[PDB]
């Protein structure tokens, strides 16, 4: 039988949501960001994630409109917490971004690796051997993706799943009336498939399929999400 991460504690763990909507300070402070838009629609992503992961028995921890400094202070608070009685940690970041980074609402940059590496085995021992899941909804550049017709020691960086809304160098999309292509597809697939016992890689493959089928007709644009993982077991949310 396939190895599966333990996933039975109540709660399963914390699910942080860093939900950046108001970019007034970025527009003021950073010259090239003078017209960066407030992220209308992001409330629908936060709401879907909250519902989805509450139903999966996570404890939801929302934080709205975080500067880069505040994001680091929040992740440090969780890095230093005792997760011994938890089975999992999830962090959802909803923001603007560019290649390898996400923006704080002040327009400063936070390298994604600087965020995730706060939860390695050495930095957060009470999460060692437990899945650390990051979902990043941000652009990773400004290119439109084109479309074509058809005991034991384990590594410090083990047990991570990084769900990116897009491949490097390209945009991801937000509909103010709906939420984002990626987070909305992710929650739909989690809600349909977790009750069937499907694992997160199966689910993220479906998210790839669904988001791939959407179109930005005005720019003949597409979006290609991209998971990366160092998971050593099947990840299911019962």
């Amino acid at each position: 039988l396939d190895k599966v991460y333990q996933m039975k504690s109540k709660p399963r763990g914390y699910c942080l949501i860093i939900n950046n909507h108001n970019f007034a300070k970025a527009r003021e402070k950073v010259p090239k960001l003078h017209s960066i838009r407030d992220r209308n629609g992001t409330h629908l992503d936060a709401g879907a994630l909250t519902t989805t992961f509450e139903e999966l028995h996570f404890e939801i921890k929302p934080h709205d409109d975080c500067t880069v400094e505040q994001i680091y202070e929040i992740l440090k608070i969780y890095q230093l917490m005792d997760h011994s009685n938890m089975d999992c940690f999830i962090c959802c970041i909803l923001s603007h971004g560019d290649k390898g980074i996400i923006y704080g609402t002040d327009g400063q940059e936070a390298p994604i690796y600087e965020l995730t590496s706060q939860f390695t085995g050495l930095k957060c021992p009470s999460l060692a051997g437990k899945p650390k899941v990051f979902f990043i909804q941000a652009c990773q550049g400004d290119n439109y993706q084109k479309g074509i017709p058809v005991t034991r020691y384990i590594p410090d960086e083990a047990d991570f799943l990084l769900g990116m809304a897009t491949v490097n160098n390209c945009v991801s999309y937000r509909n103010p009336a709906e939420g984002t292509w990626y987070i909305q597809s992710l929650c739909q697939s989690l809600r349909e498939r977790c009750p069937r016992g499907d694992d997160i890689l199966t689910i993220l493959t479906e998210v790839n399929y669904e988001v791939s089928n959407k179109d930005d007709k005005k720019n003949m644009g597409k979006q290609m999400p991209q998971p990366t993982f160092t998971l050593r077991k099947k990840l299911v949310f019962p």
């Binding site: 838009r37 992220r39 209308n40 400004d142 509909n175 005005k218």
Partner: peptide, 5 residues
């Protein structure tokens, strides 16, 4: 009216 992030 799609918007990029």
């Amino acid at each position: 009216x799609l918007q990029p992030x």
